Amino acid sequence: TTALVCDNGSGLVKAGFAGDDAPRAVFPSIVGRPRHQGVMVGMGQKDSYVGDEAQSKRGILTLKYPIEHGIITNWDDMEKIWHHTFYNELRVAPEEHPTLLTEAPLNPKANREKMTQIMFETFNVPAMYVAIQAVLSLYASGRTTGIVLDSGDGVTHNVPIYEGYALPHAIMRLDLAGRDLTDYLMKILTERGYSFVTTAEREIVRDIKEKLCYVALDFENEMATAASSSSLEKSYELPDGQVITIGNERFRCPETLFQPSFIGMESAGIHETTYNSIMKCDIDIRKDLYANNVLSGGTTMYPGIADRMQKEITALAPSTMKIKIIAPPERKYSVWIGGSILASLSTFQQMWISKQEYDEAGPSIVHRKCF
Amino acid sequence: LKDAQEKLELAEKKATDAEADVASLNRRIQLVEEELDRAQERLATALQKLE
Amino acid sequence: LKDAQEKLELAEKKATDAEADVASLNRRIQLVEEELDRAQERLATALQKLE
Numbered sequence: 001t002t003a004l005v006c007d008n009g010s011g012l013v014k015a016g017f018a019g020d021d022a023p024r025a026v027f028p029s030i031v032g033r034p035r036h037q038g039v040m041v042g043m044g045q046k047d048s049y050v051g052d053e054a055q056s057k058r059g060i061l062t063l064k065y066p067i068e069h070g071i072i073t074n075w076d077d078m079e080k081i082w083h084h085t086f087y088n089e090l091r092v093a094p095e096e097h098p099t100l101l102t103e104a105p106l107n108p109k110a111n112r113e114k115m116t117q118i119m120f121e122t123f124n125v126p127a128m129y130v131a132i133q134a135v136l137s138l139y140a141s142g143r144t145t146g147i148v149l150d151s152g153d154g155v156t157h158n159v160p161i162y163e164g165y166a167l168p169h170a171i172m173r174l175d176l177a178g179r180d181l182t183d184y185l186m187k188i189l190t191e192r193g194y195s196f197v198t199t200a201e202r203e204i205v206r207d208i209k210e211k212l213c214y215v216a217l218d219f220e221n222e223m224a225t226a227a228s229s230s231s232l233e234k235s236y237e238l239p240d241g242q243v244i245t246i247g248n249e250r251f252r253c254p255e256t257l258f259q260p261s262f263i264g265m266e267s268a269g270i271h272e273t274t275y276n277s278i279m280k281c282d283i284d285i286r287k288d289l290y291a292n293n294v295l296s297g298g299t300t301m302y303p304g305i306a307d308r309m310q311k312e313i314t315a316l317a318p319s320t321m322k323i324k325i326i327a328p329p330e331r332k333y334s335v336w337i338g339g340s341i342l343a344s345l346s347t348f349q350q351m352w353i354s355k356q357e358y359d360e361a362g363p364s365i366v367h368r369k370c371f
Numbered sequence: 372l373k374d375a376q377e378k379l380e381l382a383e384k385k386a387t388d389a390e391a392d393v394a395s396l397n398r399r400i401q402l403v404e405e406e407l408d409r410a411q412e413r414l415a416t417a418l419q420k421l422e
Numbered sequence: 423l424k425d426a427q428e429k430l431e432l433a434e435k436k437a438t439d440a441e442a443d444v445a446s447l448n449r450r451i452q453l454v455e456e457e458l459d460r461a462q463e464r465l466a467t468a469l470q471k472l473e
């Protein structure tokens with residue numbers, strides 16, 4: 001039979017059968033209970049709208065993501081999300097399909113063990129396998145080397161790989177991602193008068209960020225230009241009218257990636273954690289990693305980031321090496337495409353964690369040889 | 372509606388066409404850049420040999 | 423639909439912008455092909471000088 005390549009993610013759940021080009025169903029991972037009282041009788045009001053249904057009734061719900069930073073903080077809601085994904089968005093019972101979840105690097109063990117225990121006890125799948133979210137993004141590019149920066153919505157991690165041999169001592173995981181950029185944008189919009197507070201209006205700020213923000217090639221020049229002319233002010237229409245005008249908030253929101261001091265984080269930007277991740281590698285594979293830097297994940301879709309990052313790394317790196325940044329147009333679904341490719345391989349067909357194996361060793365089987 | 376229908380269909384076809392064009396052209400630009408870089412490495416080899 | 427009308431118009435505009443980048447990528451492809459041919463020739467002459 002065919003395998004189910006699910007990809008929990010944090011912000012958008014992407015799923016679909018193995019062997020295709022794009023995920024079959026992509027929908028936000030939010031579960032929102034209603035918060036008001038409700039007076040109409042017999043309206044058929046449910047107790048929790050999940051997935052894309054709660055992005056249409058969000059006016060009277062309190063949306064809450066079940067995955068904070070890679071890790072899962074609310075297991076009941078995550079179980080609900082998985083149940084919805086299997087039964088309503090794909091309509092395939094899990095009793096007859098292997099599953100291939102994905103997990104960020106350096107995550108707590110208990111999260112992974114609970115994930116496998118749920119998949120084997122509640123949904124009762126035949127066999128499931130958990131894979132690191134960066135190796136798949138490297139599969140999708142058709143490479144076999146390279147250092148991949150997978151800046152998702154929950155957590156940004158940077159896994160270097162050479163000739164198929166991952167370097168476990170050079171993984172640099174940073175917890176700044178799209179959600180923190182949404183919060184920072186929502187916080188700097190208040191400087192013009194627009195106040196978004198409700199958990200429903202966070203979605204509106206996210207839409208503003210997606211449609212308007214861009215990464216500046218040079219920050220100081222853009223700050224000077226936006227403060228003199230008015231060629232940058234782009235307007236946007238809220239879900240009820242009252243258009244708003246975003247000035248130099250456009251390139252200040254995604255600039256937080258390269259200067260995490262804006263949101264008070266100590267660490268260095270995504271332009272310098274990649275160079276540090278490279279320098280921890282051996283001295284003889286640094287040229288190949290320099291030449292095959294891969295971008296993935298949703299948050300790396302800002303217009304103009306593949307040039308800013310290349311300029312920064314070229315500034316840091318030695319002058320002789322060639323710096324090349326691979327930015328495929330299908331960046332958002334790169335991890336899932338790689339997952340489909342991996343699940344479609346014949347050599348991989350015996351790596352699944354078969355159910356009888358789980359019955360013999362318990363949920364701690366995932367840390368064992370079947371990784 | 373019918374007017375909207377035709378508008379929607381035509382815009383969708385145009386969008387898909389542009390996407391396919393730009394994707395294939397991206398593949399082409401990748402290939403030509405590979406040509407350039409690999410040729411450059413040949414250049415370096417030749418330079419070392421001659422010197 | 424009016425909003426679907428605006429969406430289809432915006433998507434067709436996006437298609438046209440992708441076509442403008444299609445033109446720019448075509449220019450990149452052509453110039454890099456010139457580079458490839460020039461590199462073939464220069465590498466040939468360098469190897470000959472090596473001989």
Ligand SMILES: Nc1ncnc2c1ncn2[C@@H]1O[C@H](COP(=O)(O)OP(=O)(O)O)[C@@H](O)[C@H]1O
Nearest residue numbers: 009010011012152153178210297298299301302
């Ligand atoms: N076109 C875009 N431009 C800018 N940011 C985007 C775009 N699309 C998605 N994002 C950001 O990326 C996030 C989705 O990232 P995604 O790759 O789905 O995360 P995950 O790894 O959990 O799947 C969204 O929250 C949004 O903030």
Ligand SMILES: [Mg+2]
Nearest residue numbers: 009152297335
């Ligand atoms: Mg991801």
